[PDB]
Amino acid sequence: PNYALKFTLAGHTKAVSSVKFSPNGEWLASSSADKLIKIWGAYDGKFEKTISGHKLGISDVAWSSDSNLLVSASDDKTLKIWDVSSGKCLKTLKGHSNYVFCCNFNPQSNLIVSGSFDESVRIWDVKTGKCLKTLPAHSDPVSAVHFNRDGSLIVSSSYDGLCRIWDTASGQCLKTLIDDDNPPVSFVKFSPNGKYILAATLDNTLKLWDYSKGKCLKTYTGHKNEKYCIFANFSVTGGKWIVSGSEDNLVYIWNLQTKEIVQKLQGHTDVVISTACHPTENIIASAALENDKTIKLWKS
């Protein structure tokens, strides 16, 4: 690929924590330690609006499949469901006993899954805002949570070194994945086709697992990741790549099949904590920490 810097989005007053493109490709949502969520035009990077309400820093924000809602996870121990068009906070999800770190809607956007420093994973009803189930999932902070293609499964990752797959309906632990070493698992998500799980560990490594067989199929290395929970993505609009931020302030792009690094994006002045891939165009959004505070849009 040939990703080139097109726009730089300035606005957050503290480290950016996550960036996500809306499923309809129109917008980019960002969360920050500054307690705010900001919306930007996906193609022109034009600032759209700011959504406020959280009392402390935000670690994650995610879109509902129809692009109408957002859910955010904050250190104020709550998650908030927002109506993007009006900016309204529809519900504040209370239940976690410690910082909420990660969140996602299921495919039908009728449920939300969250991970917390309280070591649990919670499943919430979107319409009522009530917690339906609490899973005693891990023995250390939960770094990521994601639903599979049909929402029947949830994958979670934790500093305890484990990746676990849960049955959404029963809450039973169906599988625990871990390799020959036990470094903290800082991020995890299912692949677009739902067959695999991409997991990041704080030993500078990304791995693609066939969770059904419980085997590691690919390993991606070359970047730096030993301290922060950096997101990773499957880029599918053009070539099939793996994308991730790095602690050396660069965005890394690997060939998913060959595992070779195909490009490194330079420009940020601090750790690239989050990256997102546009659903239809070859566009990548990247966000950096405290010494940088900006979001960058790259196009190939």
Binding site: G57, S59, Y228
Partner: peptide
């Protein structure tokens, strides 16, 4: 939050 090391 995510911006801080655990």
């Amino acid at each position: 939050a995510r911006a801080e090391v655990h």
